[PDB]
Design an enzyme around this catalytic site. Sequence first.
Site, PDB file in Angstrom:
ATOM      1  CG  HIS A  88      19.593  14.869  -6.831  1.00 40.60           C
ATOM      2  ND1 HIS A  88      18.328  15.417  -6.804  1.00 40.60           N
ATOM      3  CD2 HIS A  88      19.416  13.525  -6.859  1.00 40.60           C
ATOM      4  CE1 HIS A  88      17.433  14.447  -6.717  1.00 40.60           C
ATOM      5  NE2 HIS A  88      18.067  13.288  -6.761  1.00 40.60           N
ATOM      6  CB  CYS A  89      19.204  19.691  -3.407  1.00 43.14           C
ATOM      7  SG  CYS A  89      19.743  21.362  -3.831  1.00 43.14           S
ATOM      8  CD  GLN A  90      13.614  21.473  -6.132  1.00 46.27           C
ATOM      9  OE1 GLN A  90      13.611  22.107  -5.083  1.00 46.27           O
ATOM     10  NE2 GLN A  90      12.511  21.284  -6.851  1.00 46.27           N
ATOM     11  CB  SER A  96      23.014  18.569  -3.027  1.00 48.23           C
ATOM     12  OG  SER A  96      22.845  19.542  -4.030  1.00 48.23           O
TER      13      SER A  96
END
Length: 148
Positions: A88-90, A96
Amino acid sequence: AELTPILPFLFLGNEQDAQDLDTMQRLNIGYVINVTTHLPLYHYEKGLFNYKRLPATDSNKQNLRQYFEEAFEFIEEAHQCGKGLLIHCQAGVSRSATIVIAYLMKHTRMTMTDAYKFVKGKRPIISVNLNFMGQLLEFEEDLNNGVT
Ligand SMILES: CSc1scc2c1-c1nc(SCC(=O)C(C)(C)C)ncc1CC2
């Protein structure tokens, strides 16, 4: 909370996807890759998962190529050990999703366009970032010549 399963053991999500602890256990997720510099590693102290932080910003200056190999060895590890990995990132999964595509390019010998076609078909919302796109382009070329 909607963790998109890319491969049987590899899941793509965002900032809030990584906090749904119950969801992660239903899916037998044992590994997490957090691709931000500043978000916490969610649920770290509950000692339930193995973590890797890829401290990257969502800019047109960030280099992600450097994190590729590190990230693939950690996905291979979630596979060799029969567990799932969440990366995950945002919001909008720019960082990601760049990494998931690079994995599908090396460890599935898919093309760049075809990996992107494949990921976007399972997760519709993806922010564009031409910096990362350009870096995937040279990754594709370093693969076709065998420098990896
Ligand atoms: C490898 S991406 C790619 S290849 C060919 C195209 C695209 C594309 N991507 C995006 S968003 C995703 C991104 O920018 C990433 C963060 C995953 C690099 N929007 C539009 C297009 C147009 C056509």
